[PDB]
């Protein structure tokens, strides 16, 4: 009766959907075709003679990663109508993905998430995932939240969306679809779990010491942070914090909603022979300025909230000494208003990782969030990007050849300003 | 879908088109008959996007050629893969219209633009959707390829959402066969930078040195010598024709490097390009290919990029690799040269990929780049137009079936006032 749907969006949502619904797939036991040789019904659906169908809808107006899926392993369980693939893609054009040729394909992709919706019995919310860079995966979002707003307004649709690091911006306007649809995120969705590209490089190149990643090996590790948010709802647990308890503790203003994401025990096979890793251990790989995904500096920002979702063979007892222990630091600290910020999930199942992965068969499991101001660091770098060339104005003719007014471009800079600012109010 | 239609404007875009298609269909794994007969089940997905399926499990291009003279159309059907055409695209002329512009543009091109608007109007319509009308034609030089401006200025009317690619053939004083190269070249630019949107300024000056010093090769004859040309835009394809863990079509090129429409001329590059000897001491890296095309001599514009920075690039790598590689080399490069590059564009660079290099090699790659250095390459050709139009040299072929003497100053006004453009840059 615990229910909650997947929307893969762009060529990010596409490329991690591939390696997401590799996880879900083998922590249930059932084959890649759908068959199952309860927990899987928040994803699943059980029809037919033992064929499971994830609960999935994939829209790339690139058709080629969706005919990867269609044609890969994966071609049977996926129902082919929510496999959207679409004719010619935006081209990371936020204004073109946006109406231009997005409403092309918004009148399909409505009916199978209203099919699933209906078919549905009581959903905690969505989970979206997509990338601000892709353009057709992020102006397509602008259009398909609202939708799926009104449709759903008192659903809760959170969202993975990937960010581009300061450095590694592997586009060139993505400086401006990132913005432009952060103007979108706060009005309809209630948590953008952020989370970039480049720092888990740095995440994977030093603690599972992989010389070169691909996004294979990056997108595996973003399947475990999700799956292991969705376990309480998913699978048993001593303190079961399903999808609208943990957003409803750690989000304390209607609009701050945007912390990074978190997720130990990352590190290799060989390496995980070494350490026990103890709950003190491996809370405490998730405050560092490393672990986390984002590449921001929380030392210099303060925890407002945190909620850590345990998995594998824990007990409460270890971890009520954990979020005592951190309070003593002064490195780490809390804003004045937020006395404990420390939610704690538990679930008895291990992670069951991804074979073929560079991650390690741990038995236990850490996630972790934080709705932090060191996030506002984050785009006072792309906010810099943005407002220096719109300024020039360069790379606009296209938005405007699309349809776009200038307009929107001064709108959406001015509330991420409005929004970085309230960063500083709430801080003190 | 995102299809693609090729046409061949001059005697220079044949024996590109002949090797354009002796990659493509090669990378496809295609004989000379039409029948694929490859192993990989992949690469026909999206065979469709160049090809037309015909009956027999054979598929054939939409490989339109027009040269207003039959002696190098004879040259294509005979040679190999000379049978994997549609010979309704064979288009023929009386005369090659005399090296003028004049002929082709006006009069004697105009009296064939309906035989072949008529056939890709046909053979854009017969397909489900496309992205682009790209070409091979030489800016300067024959005046088959200048007339094909003609052929560019009037699908804008008829097309113009979609984007022309062209991939012009420069002239260069170094090697200047035609003598009326600042002519035709100079004038024929008045239209591409109102009608196109995407321009890669190849040039022989610099395809000869690319063909002497990186391959070390006693003579470059032409059918070695375009080997690299169809793989430098077979790699900007690919990424449609094959799965990119980083995607990319002709538009995002357009988009994402096109900071202002008339800035929309390019430098290509392609590595890995060695000798036979000089292969094995190579790394085979994303170093060793990023060097390999950032470097001035894996050039085929002619022209110094250490002079003026690259305002936008882009490096569609291939073969299966790591994107960190990928990554921080184009991170890395876009620092240290802080001056090759601009400031108030961060992380000029692009990327994209694919899972499927070409034949032989195990990796490849693909360079692209807009940047102020091609003003060198206008003030070359306007520096010397002038001296041939300042006492009127020829313009009685440009005056008779051709243009008023205010046709001229209007071109190398708005093509001096376009250099002036990139001059803002640096
Ligand atoms: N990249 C290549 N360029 C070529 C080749 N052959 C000629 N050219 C260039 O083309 C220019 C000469 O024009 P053409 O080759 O198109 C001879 P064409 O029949 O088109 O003359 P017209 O009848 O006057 O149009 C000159 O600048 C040469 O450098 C080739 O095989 N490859
Ligand atoms: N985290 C993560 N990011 C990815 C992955 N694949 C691509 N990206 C990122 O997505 C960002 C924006 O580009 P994409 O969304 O891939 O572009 P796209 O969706 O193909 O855009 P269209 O061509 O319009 O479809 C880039 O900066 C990539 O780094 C992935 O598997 N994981
Ligand atoms: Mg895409
Ligand atoms: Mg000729």
Redesign the pocket.
């Known amino acids: 009766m615990r229910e909650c749907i997947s929307i893969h969006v762009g060529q990010a949502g596409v490329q991690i959907g591939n390696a997401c619904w590799e996880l879900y797939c083998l922590e249930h036991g059932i084959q890649p075709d759908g068959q199952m040789p309860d927990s899987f019904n928040t994803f699943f659906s059980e029809t037919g003679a033992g064929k499971h169908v994830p609960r999935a809808v994939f829209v790339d107006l690139e058709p080629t990663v969706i005919d990867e899926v269609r044609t890969g392993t994966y071609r049977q369980l996926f129902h082919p109508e929510q496999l959207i693939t679409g004719k010619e893609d935006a081209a990371n054009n936020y204004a073109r993905g946006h109406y231009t040729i997005g409403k092309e394909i918004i009148d399909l992709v409505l009916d199978r998430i209203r099919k699933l919706a209906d078919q549905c019995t009581g959903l905690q919310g969505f989970l979206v995932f997509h990338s601000f860079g892709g353009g057709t995966g992020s102006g397509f979002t602008s259009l398909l939240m609202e939708r799926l707003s009104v449709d759903y307004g008192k659903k809760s649709k959170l969202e993975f969306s990937i960010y581009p690091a300061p450095q590694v911006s592997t586009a060139v306007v993505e400086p401006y679809n990132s913005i432009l649809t952060t103007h979108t995120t706060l009005e309809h969705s209630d948590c953008a779990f952020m989370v970039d590209n480049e720092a888990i490089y740095d995440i994977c190149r030093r603690n599972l010491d992989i010389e070169r990643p691909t996004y294979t090996n990056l997108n595996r590790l973003i399947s475990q942070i999700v799956s292991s948010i969705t376990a309480s709802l998913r699978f048993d647990g001593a303190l079961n914090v399903d999808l609208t308890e943990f957003q409803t503790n750690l989000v304390p203003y209607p609009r701050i909603h945007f912390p990074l994401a978190t997720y130990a025990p990352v590190i290799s096979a060989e390496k995980a022979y070494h350490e026990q890793l103890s709950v003190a251990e491996i809370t405490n790989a998730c405050f560092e300025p490393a672990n986390q995904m984002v590449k921001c500096d929380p030392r210099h920002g303060k925890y407002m909230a945190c909620c850590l979702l345990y998995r594998g063979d824990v007990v409460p007892k270890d971890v009520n000494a954990a979020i005592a222990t951190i309070k003593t630091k002064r490195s780490i600290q809390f804003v004045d208003w937020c006395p404990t910020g420390f939610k704690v999930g538990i679930n008895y199942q291990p992670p069951t990782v991804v074979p073929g992965g560079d991650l390690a068969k741990v038995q236990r499991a850490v996630c972790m969030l934080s709705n932090t101001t060191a996030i506002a660091e984050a785009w006072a770098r792309l906010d810099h990007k943005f407002d220096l060339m719109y300024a020039k104005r360069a790379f606009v003719h296209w938005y405007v050849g699309e349809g776009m007014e200038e307009g929107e471009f001064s709108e959406a800079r001015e509330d991420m300003a409005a929004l970085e600012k309230d960063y500083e109010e709430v801080g003190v | 879908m995102r299809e693609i239609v090729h046409i061949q404007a001059?005697?220079?875009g044949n024996?590109?088109g002949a090797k354009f298609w002796e990659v493509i269909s090669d990378e496809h794994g295609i004989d000379p008959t039409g029948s694929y007969h490859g192993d990989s089940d992949l690469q026909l997905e999206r065979i469709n996007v160049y090809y037309n399926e015909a009956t027999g499990n054979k598929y054939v291009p939409r490989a339109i050629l027009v040269?207003?003279?039959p002696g190098?159309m004879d040259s294509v059907r005979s040679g190999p893969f000379g049978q994997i055409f549609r010979p309704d695209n064979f288009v023929f002329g009386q005369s090659?219209?005399?090296?003028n512009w004049a002929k082709?543009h006006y009069t004697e091109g105009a009296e064939l633009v309906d035989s072949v608007l008529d056939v890709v109007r046909k053979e854009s319509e017969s397909c489900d959707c496309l992205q682009g009308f790209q070409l091979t034609h030489?800016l300067?030089?024959?005046?088959?390829?200048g007339?094909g401006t003609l052929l560019i200025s009037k699908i804008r009317e008829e097309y113009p959402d979609r984007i022309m690619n062209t991939f012009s053939?420069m002239?260069s004083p170094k090697?200047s066969?035609?003598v009326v190269?600042p002519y035709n070249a100079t004038l024929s630019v008045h239209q591409l930078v109102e009608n196109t949107d995407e321009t890669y300024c190849?040039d022989?000056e610099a395809?000869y040195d690319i063909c002497f010093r990186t391959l070390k090769l006693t003579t470059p004859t032409?059918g070695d010598?375009?080997h690299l040309?169809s793989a430098t835009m077979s790699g900007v394809t690919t990424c449609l024709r094959f799965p990119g863990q980083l995607n990319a079509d002709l538009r995002k090129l357009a988009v994402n490097m096109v900071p202002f429409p008339r800035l929309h001329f390019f430098m290509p590059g392609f590595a890995p390009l060695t000798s036979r000897g000089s292969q094995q001491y190579r790394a085979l890296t994303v170093p060793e290919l990023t060097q390999q095309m950032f470097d001035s001599k894996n050039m085929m514009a002619a022209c110094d990029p250490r002079h003026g920075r690259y305002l936008t690039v882009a490096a569609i790598f291939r073969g299966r690799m790591s994107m960190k590689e990928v990554d921080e080399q184009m991170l890395n490069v876009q620092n240290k040269n802080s001056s090759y590059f601009v400031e108030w564009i961060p992380n000029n660079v692009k990327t994209a990929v694919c899972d499927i290099p070409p034949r032989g090699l195990k990796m490849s790659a693909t360079f692209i780049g807009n940047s102020t250095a091609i003003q060198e390459l206008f003030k070359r050709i306007s520096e010397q137009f002038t001296a041939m139009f300042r006492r009127k040299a020829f313009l009685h072929w440009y005056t008779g079936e051709g243009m008023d003497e205010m046709e001229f100053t209007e071109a190398e006004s708005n093509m001096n006032d376009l250099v002036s453009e990139y001059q803002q840059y640096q």
């Open positions: 001059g005697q220079c024996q590109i040269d207003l003279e190098t090659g219209a005399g090296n082709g030489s300067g030089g024959g005046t088959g390829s007339m053939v002239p090697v066969d035609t190269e190849i022989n395809l032409y010598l375009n040309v």
